[PDB]
Amino acid sequence: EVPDNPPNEIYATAQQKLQDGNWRQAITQLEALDNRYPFGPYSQQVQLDLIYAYYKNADLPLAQAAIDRFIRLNPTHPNIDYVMYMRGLTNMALDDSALQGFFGVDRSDRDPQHARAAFSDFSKLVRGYPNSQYTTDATKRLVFLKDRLAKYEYSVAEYYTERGAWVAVVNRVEGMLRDYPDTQATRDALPLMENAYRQMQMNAQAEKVAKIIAANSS
Amino acid sequence: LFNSEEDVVKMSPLPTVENQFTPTTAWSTSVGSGIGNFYSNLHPALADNVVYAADRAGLVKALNADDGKEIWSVSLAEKDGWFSKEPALLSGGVTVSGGHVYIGSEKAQVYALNTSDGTVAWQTKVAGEALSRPVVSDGLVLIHTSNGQLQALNEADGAVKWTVNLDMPSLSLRGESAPTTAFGAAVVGGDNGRVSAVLMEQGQMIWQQRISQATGSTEIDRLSDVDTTPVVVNGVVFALAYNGNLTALDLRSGQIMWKRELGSVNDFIVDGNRIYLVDQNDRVMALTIDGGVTLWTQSDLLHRLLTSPVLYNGNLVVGDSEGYLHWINVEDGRFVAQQKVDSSGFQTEPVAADGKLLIQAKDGTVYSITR
């Protein structure tokens, strides 16, 4: 698949295939460069292009591995903000689905692990590099991921309200108030907390939650 | 699964020789199943023109040296049927002395059969598998068990007179070193590569000295086993270790005199001012005693698993794994003759005494070679 031409010609072919838009042959060429010439005038450029091509080709695990190795090998690289942005993007990408999205399914009830990891990476990027070129999109993605996590917690609290586990409902809504205070899911969950307090005949706490709802729903 | 996927081709071919004489088989007699495929020390014993032979399960047999006719036979395999008929797992080789026939066993038993008819005068339990050849001297029978313990059974009644511990490595070569009489002492080898000397009275250690280079990386490269019999001559001890050095040591002080990268687990011969040796690669060699200089070497039998050499009629004799007996001139490596004796291989040492050469094949057939 990969001939034995010097690194210059392999890199030229890889760049040509990336510009054309074919990720698989370009992936082959950059992998050949990385494995055969791990040092030289092309190093790190090959790894950045590998990350980009893995992301665009939906090879998310390989993109994560490449990003991890690049981060742990070149922490001082000037373009490490791009690497962290790509880490956030590939973690958010692992949080999506095709068929469910096609059918308009709300996926906030599913596993939030990848959303949590993406939030962590994007927060790292934004705090470490405020002036980066990707900071605005990173902030928008953080606002979305925060809303998603609050919605997951709301789904769990709603289920436990249905089941009749009032301590679990109160704890879940308290965790929402302590973690995602400013999300819409928290505003929707507060009535669940008030109902859970009342069902356990803790009227003083239901009164406090009702005061909060009256003071803010307006 | 697949029987056609594993094989290593590292065996020398049968050399062509012009025999200066015609080897002959005076007589042959079957002795049980024999050693078999198992690695053992069992071999005949010559005493007062009587040939004593044994078997892995045990078929102790006495045969005439002149015509292999037998005078008495016995079986030591569950004579009283304590449990079915279990094999005795004899592997000590026949020892003969004072009208007694001593044999070891891998069940940690030592038998001391009688000469007149085979009656078991005594049987003693020992510290472990009695792999070593029993050594009779000073009224004691020395055994060297597989778990690294030198015991000295009493000759008369088999009571353990004393015991000595020897270090045992995590891995070693099957077999044990037979002590030497020396002068009121016992010079023995060990699987750890340290030659030791112990007084005959009790187990007071006299000296110990390392013989193996053992500069390896893993266990298989540190196989320093001294499985040969140290040879005492004029107050110097000759020892030979596997993947180690052929060294000479002071009998009492224990300091080495000279060393040579030569290893083997087959007993060597010290005759006059010469040392006949068979290395671990089946390379017959001749050295001198004062210093190691390889007087001559032969490699035509290389990697043909050979038995220990024996000096017979002024020439060296060695068996091979295919049943061929080879004669070698002492002065030079040229083969003096060659013969086919048995289809089953020869593993255990030949016996050369009283102008008679005997061998035992893996199948248990005792052969006498003449002329």
């Binding site: 510009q19 950045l48 939906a58 999506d96 934004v126 606002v143 809303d147 973690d179 819409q184 | -």
Partner: protein, 189 residues
């Protein structure tokens, strides 16, 4: 199977996150407090402005190759610098000039005394862009310690007859000119 020219330089997503509702704080009623926030999911207020969604170019930042023997190559805002070694000396400037003459670029200014030059316009035939960029460049060679060093800078970039000053585009087409220079120097050697 089916594909579009813009699948490149685009986010592998639906861009739905731009429609997420904004976050609003909760007011604490009188006589009580709201639970203390953990601060684990706090979003700092950054005032920066930048491209979002499909308008953000995620193509990897083009880093100078530094083909000819060198180190500590860099890409500035609108300029790029490459440090060379191996005893080039004053001979560096002729080679650079020859390299840019091999590209038959429209060199407008040639000040050999100052080791400087400037061109009118060069175009790039990239399969990656939906519209081809073009830029005006100035190249020079100056002494540093033991040896000379080359520098390439862009006066401006243009698309479809109008100027553009995006940082990513400037970086990309300065690494482009720097790679051109380095490849020419390596070929000459």
């Amino acid at each position: 199977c089916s594909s579009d020219s813009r699948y490149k330089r685009q986010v592998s997503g639906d861009e739905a996150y731009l429609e997420a509702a904004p976050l609003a704080e909760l007011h604490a009623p009188a006589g009580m407090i709201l639970p203390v926030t953990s601060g684990d999911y706090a979003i700092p207020v950054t005032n920066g402005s930048g491209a979002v969604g499909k308008a953000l170019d995620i193509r990897p930042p083009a880093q100078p190759l530094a083909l000819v023997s060198g180190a500590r190559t860099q890409f500035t805002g609108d300029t790029a610098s490459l440090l060379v070694e191996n005893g080039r000396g004053n001979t560096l400037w002729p080679q650079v000039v020859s390299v840019l003459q091999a590209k038959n670029y429209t060199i407008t200014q040639r000040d050999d005394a100052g080791q400087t030059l400037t061109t009118d316009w060069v175009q790039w035939n990239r399969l990656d862009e939906d519209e081809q960029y073009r830029g005006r460049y100035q190249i020079s060679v100056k002494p540093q310690g033991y040896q000379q060093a080359v520098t390439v800078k862009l006066l401006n970039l243009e698309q479809a007859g109008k100027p553009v000053a995006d940082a990513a585009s400037m970086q990309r087409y300065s690494t482009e000119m720097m790679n051109v220079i380095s490849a020419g120097l390596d070929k000459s050697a």
